[PDB]
Amino acid sequence: MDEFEMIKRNTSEIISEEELREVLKKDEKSAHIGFEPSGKIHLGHYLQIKKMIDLQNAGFDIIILLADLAAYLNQKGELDEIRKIGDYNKKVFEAMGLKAKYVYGSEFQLDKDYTLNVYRLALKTTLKRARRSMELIAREDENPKVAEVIYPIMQVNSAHYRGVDVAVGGMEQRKIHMLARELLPKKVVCIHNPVLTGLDGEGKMSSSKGNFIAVDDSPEEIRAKIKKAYCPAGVVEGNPIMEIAKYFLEYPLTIKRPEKFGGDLTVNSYEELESLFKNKELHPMDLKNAVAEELIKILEPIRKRLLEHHHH
Amino acid sequence: MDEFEMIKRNTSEIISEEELREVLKKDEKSAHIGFEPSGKIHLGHYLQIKKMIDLQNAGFDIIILLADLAAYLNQKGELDEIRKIGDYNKKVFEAMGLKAKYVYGSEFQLDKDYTLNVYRLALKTTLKRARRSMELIAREDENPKVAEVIYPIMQVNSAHYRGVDVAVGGMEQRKIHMLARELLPKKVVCIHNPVLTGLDGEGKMSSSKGNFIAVDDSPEEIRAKIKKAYCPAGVVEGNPIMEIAKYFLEYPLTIKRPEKFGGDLTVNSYEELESLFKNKELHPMDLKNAVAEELIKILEPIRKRLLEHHHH
Ligand SMILES: N[C@@H](Cc1ccc(O)c([N+](=O)[O-])c1)C(=O)O
Ligand SMILES: N[C@@H](Cc1ccc(O)c([N+](=O)[O-])c1)C(=O)O
Ligand code: NA
Ligand code: NA
């Protein structure tokens, strides 16, 4: 498995593979992702940081944009408070092992030259296109604000202004990114990560829907959340427990089971696990027990580095 | 006729008269109007400059905003070219006798603090409200751009940032101004001037519709435009020739007529003229002849000051 395949593993799409292969040849290459600061950092965040770590191991310089001004435009509160949550998010990302440079959007997004570029992009971007690009990002609002359509053209310009070769985000970002590839003179390579399902199966995982596992959740909290989660026997699509097994667990995986239910089970890949589960040879309760315990172990170093700050 | 009545003469509305009366007491008071730079300066412009002259004679300091960045957002071209047309407009306004200070929007509208205020207003302004406020201003576009809804919140902030007591414009501006009175901490007094009808009677006078008299039109051009204009006998509403008589001509007015059509006629007010015209005692051709000749005389000093620049 080469650098390209390491980077591609567990992504939903790369726009485009040819372009990424051209980028990989260079000595100096940079990748960025932006996050609206979030009160809790969850598995969806961690999935994306893992991908940034992959890029870093492939020789990319990594920039994490703490997207305070975007969050402001998307009604997350006052800038100063948003920034404070951004600094907390930085500490969490650092506790995940990421080696990166961190920047706050507002440090450069209010510059005269940046704003003139935003207004130039505003002339090229239809309202209808801008609204469509925000459908999976915008805060729910019965009376959508002008701020909602400034946000996407802020994010288009972000990638241009900073000279990144690669932009990374979730599939929710893909329409903004396709606008960026259409309007900017240098085409940014876009790597999109899958969107995790919420624990109750009812929609996508998100910080505002309370349907997530946070990286610093206690072991007892993780077990409780997994025990209650949607996980129907034999169904893999939209199954959040199988998603965690695919995206976070290491293989070969040993699933402990009582002898009366078949005894311990060693699975050499996620793909073998999917077969066992679809063929009803693995029961949800046993999948859940293994996923909970292996996830606790995966997150333990992150939680204890954040716990050391308090001191024990 | 006091200062308040001089200011009110020939306006469509003052929001509000009480507030204007409070402003009139102060020693230091300022009024501004903004114009997207226009290749031709026409009677609609002149109507508004006349009102600014009224304010100046009432002790207001006058600021003329050459609204280059607004024009840019409203698809009038590149900033540098727009600015050049702005400097031409300044020379025309100066040739009208206005004593004022001139500022280009872009000189202050790209400042960090200005932009942060725009984004704060964008959070308070619905898309639906912003689009409604632009219906009579926005350039025709089958695919309206994000720039269209940035424009109104640029103009709201303009009045705030510069600390004007009074904003002046045409009735087309009134929805943006009512947004400004609703969102800003200091309520700006708004003076709205009527919108002139186009020469062919079919819509409002505007630079893009080629339905105007320009202040530097030749005498032969003015006569030709008036001769062809909509002017039905006995009808005053939507009659552009009667509008010119109301808003530009001085009274008492002597209308020269052949003896066979009643001989010369002296009218002591626009209101007496309206009665004569509605009662079919004054024929369109004779109204047109008087309006053309008195308008030529009114504009002659403006045209010859602009002609002196060439040199004769
Ligand atoms: N859209 C991202 C935030 C973001 C990503 C990348 C960006 O460049 C910017 N930005 O420019 O403000 C913002 C989110 O949903 O969290
Ligand atoms: N809306 C005006 C132009 C204008 C007036 C006042 C203003 O403050 C600004 N502005 O802020 O750019 C622009 C027009 O139709 O010509
Ligand atoms: Na090298
Ligand atoms: Na005094």
XYZ file of C-alpha atoms and ligand atoms in Angstrom:
658
model
C 0.000 0.000 0.000
C 1.638 3.144 -1.329
C 1.127 6.768 -0.304
C -1.730 7.266 -2.734
C -3.594 4.225 -1.424
C -2.925 5.155 2.192
C -4.404 8.568 1.490
C -7.350 7.084 -0.381
C -8.229 4.470 2.270
C -11.675 5.076 3.780
C -12.389 8.240 1.794
C -15.632 8.740 -0.109
C -14.015 10.517 -3.067
C -10.870 12.272 -4.266
C -11.370 15.072 -6.801
C -9.317 14.086 -8.712
C -6.976 11.092 -8.336
C -4.850 12.310 -11.263
C -4.411 15.668 -9.649
C -3.532 14.167 -6.285
C -0.910 12.004 -7.995
C 0.646 15.139 -9.502
C 0.690 16.747 -6.042
C 2.338 13.707 -4.466
C 5.497 14.151 -6.570
C 6.356 17.576 -5.126
C 8.684 17.980 -2.166
C 6.605 20.776 -0.602
C 2.866 20.122 -0.454
C 0.208 21.329 1.933
C -3.210 20.182 2.951
C -5.880 22.045 5.099
C -9.164 21.397 6.708
C -11.398 23.925 8.409
C -13.715 23.311 11.360
C -16.350 25.576 12.832
C -15.309 25.344 16.500
C -17.402 22.807 18.362
C -18.119 22.427 22.057
C -17.519 18.682 21.784
C -15.060 16.949 19.482
C -16.595 13.744 18.223
C -15.817 10.726 16.076
C -16.626 12.620 12.876
C -13.939 15.114 13.749
C -11.560 12.285 14.640
C -12.168 10.519 11.339
C -11.017 13.659 9.524
C -8.008 14.271 11.778
C -6.953 10.677 11.120
C -7.009 11.510 7.408
C -4.936 14.622 8.040
C -2.427 12.399 9.878
C -2.316 10.158 6.828
C -1.481 13.167 4.653
C 1.179 14.301 7.143
C 2.769 10.835 7.012
C 2.789 11.241 3.217
C 4.947 14.378 3.606
C 2.212 17.042 3.541
C 2.433 20.107 5.741
C -0.899 20.260 7.575
C -2.854 23.411 8.423
C -5.923 23.265 10.671
C -8.210 26.271 10.144
C -10.174 27.126 13.265
C -12.999 28.657 11.249
C -14.164 31.232 13.746
C -15.555 33.743 11.226
C -17.417 31.052 9.310
C -18.913 29.874 12.576
C -19.880 33.488 13.298
C -21.587 33.746 9.919
C -23.354 30.430 10.652
C -24.874 31.764 13.886
C -22.713 29.943 16.420
C -22.352 33.050 18.622
C -19.934 35.880 19.276
C -16.462 35.797 17.781
C -14.566 35.996 21.052
C -16.416 33.043 22.535
C -16.149 31.083 19.325
C -12.386 31.664 19.334
C -12.159 30.317 22.874
C -13.847 27.099 21.772
C -11.386 27.068 18.873
C -8.433 27.047 21.252
C -10.023 24.098 23.095
C -10.434 22.270 19.784
C -6.714 22.843 19.060
C -5.815 21.135 22.362
C -8.020 18.163 21.466
C -6.484 17.836 18.000
C -3.031 18.013 19.577
C -4.076 15.247 21.984
C -4.963 13.130 18.953
C -1.279 13.232 17.957
C -1.615 15.623 15.047
C 1.459 17.699 14.264
C 0.121 20.788 12.562
C -0.028 24.562 12.336
C -3.264 26.172 13.509
C -4.754 29.406 12.157
C -7.942 31.296 12.998
C -9.966 32.404 9.983
C -10.335 35.924 11.275
C -6.596 36.400 11.368
C -6.620 36.806 7.477
C -10.373 36.716 6.301
C -10.992 40.368 7.128
C -7.973 41.719 5.205
C -8.878 44.273 2.514
C -7.531 42.063 -0.240
C -9.386 39.025 1.095
C -12.673 40.935 1.223
C -12.246 42.303 -2.307
C -11.791 38.706 -3.464
C -14.954 37.637 -1.641
C -16.907 40.394 -3.394
C -15.424 39.386 -6.761
C -16.512 35.785 -6.116
C -19.928 37.058 -5.057
C -20.376 38.441 -8.571
C -19.697 34.990 -10.069
C -21.766 32.909 -7.616
C -25.516 32.685 -7.996
C -27.724 32.878 -4.925
C -29.331 29.628 -5.926
C -25.883 27.886 -6.184
C -24.733 29.374 -2.852
C -27.852 28.242 -1.028
C -27.597 24.763 -2.538
C -23.972 24.503 -1.375
C -25.035 25.230 2.205
C -27.937 22.769 2.538
C -25.954 20.349 4.732
C -24.000 23.013 6.654
C -26.270 25.950 7.383
C -27.825 26.254 10.815
C -31.560 25.616 10.748
C -33.320 28.933 10.155
C -36.925 29.526 9.123
C -35.774 32.935 7.777
C -32.374 32.350 6.149
C -29.963 35.286 6.496
C -27.626 36.959 4.012
C -24.788 35.554 6.127
C -25.706 32.082 4.867
C -24.626 32.881 1.293
C -21.499 34.819 2.310
C -20.227 31.713 4.095
C -19.611 29.545 1.003
C -17.765 32.235 -0.953
C -15.614 32.892 2.410
C -14.669 29.219 2.199
C -13.933 29.265 -1.565
C -11.569 32.153 -1.132
C -9.906 30.480 1.965
C -8.348 27.717 -0.128
C -7.175 30.234 -2.772
C -5.695 32.753 -0.376
C -3.576 30.269 1.579
C -2.216 28.334 -1.410
C -3.132 24.811 -0.306
C -2.691 21.952 -2.733
C -5.318 19.787 -1.008
C -8.517 20.627 0.842
C -10.010 17.949 3.110
C -13.503 17.762 4.528
C -16.617 15.738 4.905
C -18.931 15.006 2.048
C -21.139 17.855 3.324
C -18.498 20.263 1.976
C -18.489 18.883 -1.535
C -20.699 21.453 -3.229
C -18.670 24.360 -1.803
C -15.536 22.568 -3.036
C -16.948 22.037 -6.530
C -17.722 25.766 -6.617
C -14.167 26.494 -5.606
C -12.794 24.197 -8.475
C -15.056 26.013 -10.879
C -14.220 29.636 -9.885
C -10.574 29.683 -8.813
C -7.574 29.769 -11.191
C -5.711 26.915 -9.419
C -7.778 23.757 -8.984
C -7.530 22.502 -5.399
C -7.517 18.730 -4.948
C -10.448 17.830 -2.709
C -10.511 14.799 -0.407
C -13.935 14.024 1.047
C -14.457 11.791 4.035
C -17.690 9.880 4.693
C -20.378 11.299 6.941
C -21.001 9.113 9.963
C -24.505 8.062 10.895
C -25.941 9.189 14.196
C -26.101 6.707 17.036
C -29.892 6.387 16.782
C -29.702 5.746 13.030
C -32.068 8.601 12.240
C -29.721 11.040 10.529
C -26.101 12.030 10.244
C -23.896 12.455 13.307
C -23.555 16.004 14.325
C -22.680 18.210 17.318
C -26.093 19.958 17.380
C -28.087 16.690 17.264
C -26.594 15.039 20.352
C -26.152 11.773 18.471
C -22.379 11.361 18.740
C -19.590 9.781 20.752
C -17.118 12.431 21.920
C -13.451 11.558 21.965
C -13.283 12.410 25.690
C -16.474 10.519 26.699
C -15.923 8.316 29.734
C -15.758 4.550 29.221
C -19.140 4.178 30.958
C -20.621 6.822 28.647
C -19.268 5.077 25.541
C -20.677 1.727 26.624
C -24.064 3.279 27.344
C -24.202 5.121 24.025
C -23.257 1.998 22.048
C -25.679 -0.215 23.979
C -28.588 2.055 23.006
C -27.490 2.543 19.409
C -29.268 1.488 16.249
C -27.746 -1.790 15.072
C -30.249 -4.130 13.391
C -29.124 -7.688 12.780
C -27.767 -8.326 9.309
C -27.984 -4.699 8.114
C -24.844 -2.705 7.443
C -26.084 0.387 5.606
C -26.739 3.243 8.008
C -25.523 1.104 10.929
C -23.386 3.369 13.146
C -21.731 0.466 15.023
C -20.506 -1.105 11.807
C -19.266 2.325 10.691
C -17.169 2.615 13.841
C -15.787 -0.857 13.207
C -14.829 0.115 9.666
C -13.327 3.515 10.332
C -11.653 3.257 13.761
C -10.887 -0.348 14.693
C -7.693 -2.211 13.879
C -7.672 -5.658 12.269
C -7.274 -8.485 12.914
C -10.004 -7.985 15.450
C -10.774 -10.528 18.170
C -14.426 -10.458 19.259
C -14.874 -12.026 22.685
C -18.059 -14.101 22.969
C -19.285 -16.688 25.492
C -18.734 -20.248 24.296
C -22.495 -20.727 24.302
C -22.788 -18.151 21.512
C -19.891 -19.490 19.453
C -16.845 -18.494 21.478
C -14.264 -15.843 20.638
C -14.028 -14.826 16.998
C -11.020 -13.458 15.101
C -11.820 -11.287 12.076
C -8.953 -10.416 9.748
C -10.591 -7.440 8.011
C -13.593 -5.156 8.187
C -14.779 -6.843 5.007
C -14.859 -10.317 6.795
C -16.770 -8.622 9.665
C -19.341 -7.286 7.191
C -19.867 -10.805 5.843
C -20.291 -12.346 9.296
C -22.750 -9.604 10.250
C -24.843 -9.727 7.069
C -25.034 -13.532 7.334
C -26.356 -13.185 10.916
C -23.374 -15.157 12.196
C -22.449 -12.208 14.437
C -25.101 -10.835 16.794
C -25.459 -7.079 17.457
C -24.837 -7.475 21.179
C -21.446 -9.107 20.555
C -20.498 -6.620 17.858
C -21.492 -3.809 20.205
C -19.477 -5.226 23.108
C -16.327 -5.502 20.990
C -16.777 -2.093 19.346
C -17.287 -0.403 22.710
C -14.218 -1.946 24.299
C -11.877 -1.454 21.367
C -13.104 2.142 20.907
C -12.468 2.889 24.586
C -8.880 1.691 24.142
C -8.453 3.776 20.987
C -9.692 6.936 22.668
C -8.013 6.362 26.048
C -4.754 8.199 25.218
C -6.770 11.205 23.987
C -9.014 11.335 27.047
C -6.106 10.872 29.536
C -4.008 13.643 27.734
C -7.012 15.936 28.130
C -7.460 14.713 31.719
C -3.806 15.390 32.583
C -4.560 19.135 31.973
C -6.889 19.061 35.076
C -4.051 16.844 36.457
C -5.341 13.173 37.096
C -41.138 79.364 3.871
C -38.760 78.234 6.591
C -35.826 75.825 6.406
C -37.998 72.805 7.094
C -40.415 73.700 4.301
C -37.602 74.516 1.891
C -36.139 71.095 2.588
C -39.520 69.406 2.268
C -40.494 71.090 -1.026
C -40.869 68.569 -3.859
C -39.885 65.540 -1.780
C -41.967 62.370 -1.721
C -41.420 61.678 1.986
C -39.301 62.563 5.008
C -38.763 59.782 7.557
C -39.508 61.423 9.921
C -40.434 65.126 10.034
C -40.048 65.169 13.832
C -36.576 63.772 13.573
C -35.571 66.217 10.861
C -36.815 69.072 13.048
C -34.570 67.843 15.872
C -31.627 67.733 13.446
C -32.299 71.263 12.209
C -31.588 72.758 15.653
C -27.961 71.583 15.763
C -25.104 73.780 14.599
C -23.222 70.884 12.966
C -25.339 68.602 10.790
C -24.469 66.498 7.784
C -26.360 64.983 4.927
C -25.136 62.395 2.278
C -26.303 60.811 -0.873
C -24.620 58.007 -2.764
C -24.639 57.448 -6.525
C -23.448 54.461 -8.497
C -21.288 56.298 -11.055
C -23.161 56.846 -14.292
C -21.901 57.498 -17.799
C -24.503 60.239 -18.219
C -25.806 62.552 -15.516
C -29.489 63.139 -16.065
C -32.424 65.076 -14.665
C -33.026 62.475 -11.954
C -29.530 63.081 -10.685
C -30.058 66.839 -10.935
C -33.296 66.676 -8.966
C -31.389 65.070 -6.092
C -28.424 67.453 -6.277
C -30.901 70.335 -6.111
C -32.192 68.825 -2.866
C -28.646 68.531 -1.552
C -28.194 72.239 -2.365
C -31.323 72.966 -0.359
C -29.838 71.121 2.619
C -26.531 72.979 2.196
C -28.404 76.303 2.228
C -30.015 75.100 5.472
C -26.534 74.790 7.036
C -25.873 71.086 6.383
C -22.420 69.864 5.456
C -22.908 67.795 2.298
C -21.071 64.584 1.410
C -21.450 63.002 -2.032
C -20.565 59.292 -1.992
C -19.265 58.105 -5.342
C -20.458 54.559 -4.717
C -17.847 52.709 -6.714
C -17.922 49.463 -4.702
C -21.710 49.320 -4.743
C -21.608 49.800 -8.491
C -19.044 46.987 -8.660
C -21.344 44.719 -6.669
C -24.209 45.713 -9.006
C -22.297 44.576 -12.104
C -21.358 47.951 -13.564
C -17.808 46.805 -14.412
C -14.300 46.946 -13.013
C -13.525 49.159 -10.047
C -10.858 51.248 -11.738
C -13.116 52.141 -14.644
C -16.049 52.765 -12.357
C -13.894 55.151 -10.316
C -12.987 57.067 -13.464
C -16.671 57.591 -14.223
C -17.030 58.676 -10.596
C -14.491 61.451 -11.072
C -16.444 62.623 -14.142
C -19.642 62.641 -12.081
C -17.884 64.816 -9.460
C -17.053 67.390 -12.163
C -20.690 67.434 -13.290
C -21.975 67.886 -9.737
C -19.467 70.699 -9.249
C -20.753 72.296 -12.464
C -24.238 72.221 -10.948
C -22.978 74.598 -8.239
C -22.853 72.100 -5.402
C -20.322 72.836 -2.678
C -19.535 69.470 -1.167
C -16.958 66.914 -0.099
C -16.672 63.824 -2.295
C -15.673 60.345 -1.112
C -15.326 57.029 -2.938
C -16.967 54.084 -1.192
C -13.909 51.912 -1.553
C -11.801 54.368 0.380
C -13.480 53.107 3.681
C -15.860 50.123 2.733
C -13.055 47.566 2.663
C -11.654 48.432 6.117
C -11.562 45.471 8.527
C -13.951 47.158 10.920
C -16.349 48.063 8.111
C -16.393 44.483 6.829
C -16.981 43.034 10.304
C -19.987 45.352 10.578
C -21.297 44.178 7.205
C -21.062 40.559 8.362
C -22.821 41.429 11.635
C -25.627 43.078 9.641
C -25.726 40.042 7.364
C -26.695 37.948 10.387
C -29.664 40.251 11.092
C -30.895 40.676 7.496
C -32.970 37.980 5.859
C -32.290 37.021 2.259
C -35.909 37.651 1.450
C -35.733 41.210 2.963
C -32.434 41.952 1.171
C -33.770 40.851 -2.196
C -36.960 42.858 -1.702
C -34.902 45.968 -0.896
C -33.048 45.637 -4.203
C -36.010 45.157 -6.567
C -35.763 48.696 -7.988
C -31.948 48.924 -7.913
C -30.473 45.589 -8.916
C -29.230 45.129 -12.457
C -31.442 42.784 -14.450
C -30.123 39.246 -14.009
C -31.863 35.973 -14.828
C -29.522 34.315 -12.272
C -29.214 36.760 -9.361
C -25.786 36.751 -7.685
C -24.746 36.772 -4.032
C -23.404 40.273 -4.699
C -27.001 41.481 -5.003
C -27.727 40.859 -1.306
C -24.363 42.177 -0.074
C -25.150 45.526 -1.692
C -28.014 46.566 0.622
C -26.189 45.717 3.849
C -23.024 47.727 2.327
C -25.383 50.690 2.048
C -26.913 50.245 5.538
C -23.499 50.255 7.106
C -22.396 53.315 4.967
C -24.760 55.674 6.780
C -23.717 54.268 10.192
C -19.986 54.362 9.601
C -19.844 57.980 8.429
C -22.145 59.443 11.092
C -24.584 61.284 8.826
C -27.699 62.802 10.327
C -29.615 62.689 7.029
C -29.533 60.286 4.099
C -31.030 61.465 0.796
C -32.051 59.388 -2.186
C -34.768 58.488 -4.582
C -37.807 56.536 -3.580
C -36.091 53.440 -5.026
C -33.801 53.505 -1.971
C -36.578 53.496 0.582
C -36.568 49.823 1.514
C -32.792 49.828 2.098
C -33.289 52.942 4.245
C -36.089 51.360 6.280
C -33.761 48.411 6.906
C -31.088 50.806 8.052
C -33.588 52.538 10.530
C -34.511 49.125 11.831
C -30.976 47.694 12.351
C -28.729 50.602 13.320
C -28.492 52.139 16.818
C -28.830 55.757 15.575
C -31.868 56.355 13.372
C -30.861 58.240 10.221
C -33.385 60.752 8.901
C -34.256 59.746 5.345
C -35.339 62.202 2.646
C -36.741 60.557 -0.480
C -37.104 62.346 -3.773
C -39.651 61.360 -6.433
C -38.710 59.064 -9.286
C -39.068 60.758 -12.648
C -40.971 59.097 -15.454
C -39.138 58.170 -18.617
C -39.592 60.344 -21.669
C -41.692 57.710 -23.455
C -43.968 57.304 -20.427
C -43.365 53.566 -20.246
C -41.370 53.304 -17.031
C -39.130 55.253 -14.717
C -36.261 57.372 -16.023
C -32.995 55.631 -15.791
C -29.469 55.632 -17.260
C -29.724 52.046 -18.592
C -33.087 52.627 -20.332
C -32.050 55.546 -22.544
C -35.186 57.462 -21.596
C -33.622 60.550 -20.016
C -32.483 64.100 -20.668
C -28.822 64.525 -19.712
C -27.756 67.771 -18.118
C -25.176 68.298 -20.891
C -27.511 67.417 -23.814
C -27.337 69.984 -26.598
C -30.275 72.360 -27.045
C -31.219 70.562 -30.280
C -31.131 67.220 -28.452
C -33.357 68.527 -25.648
C -35.905 69.893 -28.102
C -35.959 66.615 -30.013
C -36.352 64.508 -26.878
C -39.201 66.676 -25.561
C -40.954 66.795 -28.937
C -41.119 62.984 -29.029
C -42.075 62.566 -25.383
C -45.258 61.134 -23.941
C -47.552 64.024 -23.032
C -51.259 63.251 -23.502
C -53.654 66.172 -23.331
C -55.252 66.689 -19.943
C -53.303 63.930 -18.148
C -50.744 64.794 -15.503
C -49.979 61.464 -13.831
C -46.978 59.785 -15.420
C -46.510 62.768 -17.758
C -42.753 63.458 -17.934
C -43.170 66.982 -19.382
C -45.381 68.058 -16.508
C -42.868 66.510 -14.091
C -40.105 68.658 -15.558
C -42.331 71.707 -15.216
C -42.969 70.895 -11.565
C -39.458 70.009 -10.494
C -37.147 72.265 -12.543
C -38.962 75.344 -13.838
C -39.271 78.654 -12.025
C -42.595 80.444 -11.559
C -44.155 82.690 -12.607
C -43.759 81.018 -15.951
C -44.598 82.754 -19.229
C -45.671 80.316 -21.954
C -45.293 81.848 -25.404
C -48.126 80.905 -27.772
C -49.305 82.286 -31.129
C -52.261 84.641 -30.765
C -54.332 82.195 -32.792
C -53.991 79.643 -29.985
C -54.683 82.087 -27.162
C -51.536 84.197 -27.043
C -48.838 84.193 -24.374
C -49.825 82.800 -20.994
C -48.404 83.653 -17.563
C -48.711 80.927 -14.921
C -47.935 81.882 -11.331
C -47.387 78.359 -9.972
C -47.004 74.762 -11.055
C -50.388 74.159 -9.458
C -52.062 76.752 -11.854
C -50.249 75.008 -14.757
C -51.699 71.656 -13.676
C -55.195 73.158 -13.721
C -54.772 74.699 -17.174
C -53.412 71.406 -18.509
C -56.068 69.147 -16.973
C -58.804 71.484 -18.251
C -57.347 71.205 -21.787
C -56.776 74.959 -21.837
C -53.063 74.335 -22.471
C -52.085 72.123 -25.407
C -49.167 69.650 -25.184
C -47.291 71.299 -28.041
C -47.245 74.654 -26.227
C -46.354 73.089 -22.893
C -43.569 71.177 -24.620
C -42.216 74.283 -26.356
C -42.043 76.225 -23.087
C -40.587 73.321 -21.095
C -37.885 72.729 -23.700
C -36.805 76.353 -23.852
C -36.853 77.011 -20.126
C -35.018 73.721 -19.454
C -32.322 74.643 -21.980
C -31.778 77.914 -20.104
C -31.651 76.107 -16.758
C -29.059 73.625 -17.970
C -27.003 76.073 -20.056
C -24.584 77.082 -17.260
C -23.932 73.393 -16.501
C -23.320 72.445 -20.126
C -21.068 75.494 -20.828
C -18.990 74.818 -17.580
C -18.490 71.269 -18.844
C -17.777 72.625 -22.341
C -15.170 75.087 -21.036
C -13.086 72.010 -19.965
C -12.640 71.139 -23.720
C -12.263 74.969 -23.988
C -15.216 76.512 -26.096
N -17.373 24.449 6.270
C -16.543 23.950 7.417
C -15.727 25.105 7.982
C -14.674 25.693 7.032
C -13.865 24.844 6.276
C -12.907 25.359 5.434
C -12.767 26.750 5.330
O -11.817 27.283 4.524
C -13.570 27.594 6.080
N -13.457 28.992 5.985
O -12.850 29.492 5.050
O -13.951 29.708 6.857
C -14.539 27.070 6.928
C -17.432 23.334 8.475
O -18.586 22.956 8.136
O -16.980 23.182 9.633
N -28.055 52.765 -3.884
C -27.460 53.977 -4.538
C -25.956 53.986 -4.299
C -25.523 54.144 -2.835
C -26.155 55.081 -2.018
C -25.764 55.242 -0.709
C -24.735 54.437 -0.200
O -24.317 54.590 1.081
C -24.108 53.505 -1.010
N -23.082 52.679 -0.520
O -22.910 52.569 0.684
O -22.344 52.085 -1.309
C -24.507 53.344 -2.332
C -27.784 53.985 -6.016
O -28.760 53.295 -6.414
O -27.102 54.705 -6.781
Na 14.343 17.287 -3.036
Na -23.456 78.137 17.999
